[PDB]
Each structure stands twice: as structure tokens, then as C-alpha cells.
Copies of this chain bind each other. A is one copy, B any other.
Amino acid sequence: MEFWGVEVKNGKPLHLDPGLDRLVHISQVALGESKNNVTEPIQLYVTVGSDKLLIGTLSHEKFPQLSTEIVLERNFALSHTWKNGSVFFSGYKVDL
């Protein structure tokens, strides 16, 4: 049980690996601050072995964060559709 987190900037897929005999457990997703205040809804994706899964759609006004239980035992990528800001993903790494 080790705290884990990342900031995905401007949506470009961030490729991650839990490591041998580990899982990443993502528990918290948060929409970062806007520089402009042109806010469209922002889609969030986890890509695992190809399959690209929508996990949610955030907005500053209505959906600025999610409490989640996403469990990843293999290489994956996090990505989102906001070209001008960050989405924060956090949780913890687990053994076995």
C-alpha cells in the first residue's frame, strides 16, 4: 500500500506500468484549474491492452471530480480531451 498519483496535462495519453506483482488502484479523479474559463465537458479514458474505456465526463461547473475504484494490473494509459489543462489521478499501489 503506497500512495500513488499523477497529473495528466493537456490530455496526451500518459503510459504507465504498475510493475511486477503490483496493481494500481485509482480512487480519486479531479479536474484542474482553468486558465481561460472556456469549459467544454472533458472525457476521461483508461486504455488497457487496446480497449479504450470511457470512465467519465468532468466539468468545472457540475462534475469537477470523481470517487472511483479502478484496478490495473498491467500497462495502461490515462488520457482526456482537455487540451488546455490537467486532470489529476490518485490512489495507491498494492502488492500481489
Contact = CB atoms under 8 A, between A and B. Distances in A.
A68 B91 CA distance: 10
A6 B33 CA distance: 25
A78 interface: no
Q: SS class of chain A's interface: helix, strand, loop or mixed?
A: strand
Total identical chains: 5
B67 A69 contact: yes
Contacts of A73: 1-3, 92
Interface of A: 1-3, 5-7, 23, 27-28, 30-33, 41, 43, 46, 48, 51, 53-57, 60, 62-74, 76, 86, 88, 90-92, 96
18 contacts: A3-B46, A3-B70, A3-B71, A5-B46, A5-B53, A7-B54, A27-B69, A27-B70, A28-B70, A30-B54, A30-B57, A33-B41, A33-B43, A41-B60, A46-B90, A55-B88, A56-B65, A66-B67
